[PDB]
Structure 1
Amino acid sequence: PALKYGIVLDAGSSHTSMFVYKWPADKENDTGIVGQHSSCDVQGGGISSYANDPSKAGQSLVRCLEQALRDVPRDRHASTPLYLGATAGMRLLNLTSPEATARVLEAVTQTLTQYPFDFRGARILSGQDEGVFGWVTANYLLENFIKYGWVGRWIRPRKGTLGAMDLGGASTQITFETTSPSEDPGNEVHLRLYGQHYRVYTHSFLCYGRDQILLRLLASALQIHRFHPCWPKGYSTQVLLQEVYQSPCTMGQRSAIVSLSGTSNATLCRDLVSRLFNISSCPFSQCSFNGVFQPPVAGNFIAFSAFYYTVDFLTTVMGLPVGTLKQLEEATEITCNQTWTELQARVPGQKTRLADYCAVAMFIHQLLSRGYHFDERSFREVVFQKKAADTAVGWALGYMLNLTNLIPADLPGLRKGTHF
């Protein structure tokens, strides 16, 4: 049972993770065959957080790369491909300073080239890449690309695919198979996988990741209220204004330090979040928001990353159902109305992120209902999960599959034309 391995470093805005994948040498073009073998969480921030100290970006990777030498057998190092892909942290740094961006990419490249893996490059993914590759990960792992049935009796229509919603720290993606006509080339994706054509919609909303949304709501609370209606009553902190306004995401919203306190006001919080979504103009037949084309959502979806972490909080810590859009809205209201002592009574251990759940839950409720136009019928088809077949869901597996060429466009010998 001879195995091959492959490695991806996912260099997100808030963290870097390393995934090591393994697969049998001679079944390697089978769908769903590649699985996660191990992973590692790099300590500290994302590589973009070393914008002004680029050499620390390369050093941040060492510990996880030392784990990869132990995870992958030594005789396979030389032939195990290694990739780094970076997402919206580096896309935002690139708007601010393409030179500092280059110096960070150079430092991670220098570090990664000292290791004995087959290093295939450090790249910034486009928004489209990031959305499509997570869609391919989820569907590959759940075996949605198998042609179901047998000769003389193929299931029709073919097996549906799972849409993907990824809430990262600095951008959010929505990607799904659609029968609707394309109206914007930047959203239009055509894939050829195991002999089949998939027509796909994708969009990445830069600045609509969790950390950037929190920063925009804070900038907005500062300007409109001088209290934060999404923060819990009893919670307060010293806000450093230069950190609030240095993001490309908040420059458009412009004393070194101001005290700001929560007020547990679910209604004002909802009003605050609503201003994130411009619904006033659409140059297409229909839009999601901000003038962006989007056909009707359809089919099942998996919502992972911060959709999952936030729903996990509402169900596991607050003990509240989130099965319907109306329950998610009630759960957000109850969470937002909690005072800071009440929220802390529920969380015996570390309290990081605790003051932010109200704002994040509220954004997610609005994003799904107002931004993407899910309703009770389509929302019922959404599941919140972060893992499929023992593999973390994300873009890293899909990316690895594509660059290593492990998903054939067509089946061998076209399977004798038996799927025509």
Structure 2
Amino acid sequence: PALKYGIVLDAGSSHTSMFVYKWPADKENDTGIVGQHSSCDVQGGGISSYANDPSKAGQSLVRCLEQALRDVPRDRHASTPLYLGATAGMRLLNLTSPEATARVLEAVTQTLTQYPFEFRGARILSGQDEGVFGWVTANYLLENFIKYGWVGRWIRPRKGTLGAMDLGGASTQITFETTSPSEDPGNEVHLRLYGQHYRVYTHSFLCYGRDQILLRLLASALQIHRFHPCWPKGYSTQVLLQEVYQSPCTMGQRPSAIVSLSGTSNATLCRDLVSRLFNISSCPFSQCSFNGVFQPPVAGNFIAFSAFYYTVDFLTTVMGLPVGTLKQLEEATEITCNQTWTELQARVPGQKTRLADYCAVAMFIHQLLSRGYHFDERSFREVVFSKKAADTAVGWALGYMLNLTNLIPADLPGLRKGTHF
């Protein structure tokens, strides 16, 4: 059983992950056949955190690269393609300093070319790529692209597809198959997968990832309240003003060089702070999500992964609270946000370095779903929070790999004698 391999570096905003995929040479074109072989998490920040010292971006990857040398058998190395894709962190760096951004890419390129894998390039994904490839990953792994039934009795309608909601560090994406007419070409996607047309909606909200949201809520709290209602009572920190406003996401909020900001465990005021992130006041289309962006109604099942999954896992596994309904999700965030700092710490016996931020991130998810995308009780119950399908991390990495390696055919071998006609 001869296996081929492929590696993707997912250079996210606050960190980098490497995923190695494997698949039998013989059957590489069946849907769901590629699975994850191993992965590795790179220590320290994302490649964009090295703008001021671009050689370290490259170097940060060495340890995970060595692991890849070990995970992929030595005689497959040279025919194993290697890709790096970078997301909103490098898109944000691109607005700040396209030159710093260019040096970061060159530095990772130089490190990755030293390795004996088939290096295929370091690129920044568009926001459309990042949402569409995550939708691909999830539906590929769950075999939603198979045509179900048999001759003379095909399943009708066609097998439904899973929508994808990805919460990264610096943007968030929503992508799903829709029947609604398109009102904006920027959001419109057409795929031809295994002989089938999939009409797909996608949008990436830059500056709406987990970390940039936290930064914006902090600047917003500082300006409206002088206390942080999303932070727990008894928690405080000295905020350096200059750093709060340095991100493209917060510089629009820039108004004694250090200010002490204390939490108040205030779920109401936290929810009000979060709801101001979603500008729902204008819509130049028939219908919108927020900030004037076209969005047809959400429909079908969704997988919500990356930070959606980890935040909900915290609510259920560590807070011990149900989240099966929007209402229950809302209640879970209230209870979480109302914990004092000592109460919250007492429920987590480990080292949680970002414990004070769970309240805000949870409030953010609840409002993004309800006020942003307009899930309600009925549609929310088709949302599954999961980080994994078929032994593979759900992300855009796999779909990106499948696409650049050309492992999903547009049509079927022989057009399957044309019986999906």
Q: Tell me which interval the TM-score lies in, with the shorter structure as reference length.
A: over 0.9
Give per-residue Cα distances to partners, 1:2-25, cap 9 Å, x unaligned: 000000000000100000000000
Q: Distance in 2 between matches of 1:13 and 1:91?
A: 9
Give per-residue Cα distances to partners, 1:22-67, cap 9 Å, x unaligned: 0000100000000000000000000000000000000000000000
Give per-residue Cα distances to partners, 1:390-413, cap 9 Å, x unaligned: 100000000000000000000001
SS of the equivalent of 1:94 reads helix
Give per-residue Cα distances to partners, 1:303-343, cap 9 Å, x unaligned: 00000000000000100000000000000000011100000
Give per-residue Cα distances to partners, 1:92-127, cap 9 Å, x unaligned: 000000000000000000000000000000000000
SS of the equivalent of 2:108 reads helix
Q: Corresponding residue for 2:295? A: 294
Q: Distance in 2 between matches of 1:83 and 1:256?
A: 42
> How far is 1:80 from its partner?
0.2
Q: Corresponding residue for 1:349? A: 350
Q: Distance in 2 between matches of 1:45 and 1:359?
A: 22
Percentage of identical aligned residues: 100
> How far is 1:240 from its partner?
1.3
Q: Corresponding residue for 2:333? A: 332
SS of the equivalent of 2:242 reads helix
Q: Distance in 1 between matches of 2:240 and 2:76?
A: 49
Paired residues, what number? 420
Give per-residue Cα distances to partners, 1:268-302, cap 9 Å, x unaligned: 00110011000000000000000000000000000
Q: Distance in 2 between matches of 1:256 and 1:67?
A: 44
> How far is 1:257 from its partner?
1.2
> How far is 1:353 from its partner?
1.4
Q: Distance in 2 between matches of 1:354 and 1:252?
A: 27
Give per-residue Cα distances to partners, 1:129-153, cap 9 Å, x unaligned: 0000000000000000000000000
Give per-residue Cα distances to partners, 1:333-388, cap 9 Å, x unaligned: 00011100000110011021110011111010000001000000000000000000
Q: Distance in 2 between matches of 1:257 and 1:195?
A: 60
> How far is 1:78 from its partner?
0.5
SS of the equivalent of 1:32 reads coil
Of 387-396 and 253-262, more deviation after overlay is shown by 253-262
Q: Distance in 1 between matches of 2:287 and 2:87?
A: 28
SS of the equivalent of 1:366 reads helix
SS of the equivalent of 1:323 reads coil
SS of the equivalent of 1:246 reads coil
Q: Distance in 2 between matches of 1:28 and 1:128?
A: 26
Q: Corresponding residue for 2:128? A: 128
> How far is 1:243 from its partner?
1.4
What TM-score comes out, normalization by structure 2 length?
Answer: 0.99
Of 239-248 and 158-167, more deviation after overlay is shown by 239-248
> How far is 1:256 from its partner?
2.1
SS of the equivalent of 2:217 reads helix
SS of the equivalent of 2:179 reads coil
Q: Distance in 2 between matches of 1:270 and 1:396?
A: 33
Q: Corresponding residue for 1:398? A: 399
Give per-residue Cα distances to partners, 1:194-228, cap 9 Å, x unaligned: 00000000000000000000000000000011100
Q: Corresponding residue for 2:184? A: 184
Alignment gaps of 5+ in structure 1? none
Q: Distance in 1 between matches of 2:133 and 2:115?
A: 26
Q: Distance in 2 between matches of 1:342 and 1:215?
A: 24
What TM-score comes out, normalization by structure 1 length?
Answer: 1.00
SS of the equivalent of 1:107 reads helix
Q: Distance in 2 between matches of 1:378 and 1:341?
A: 36
Q: Distance in 2 between matches of 1:4 and 1:373?
A: 43
SS of the equivalent of 1:201 reads strand
Structure 1 residue ranges (4+ consecutive) displaced by more than 6 angstroms after TM superposition = none
Give per-residue Cα distances to partners, 1:60-99, cap 9 Å, x unaligned: 0000000000000000000000000000000000000000
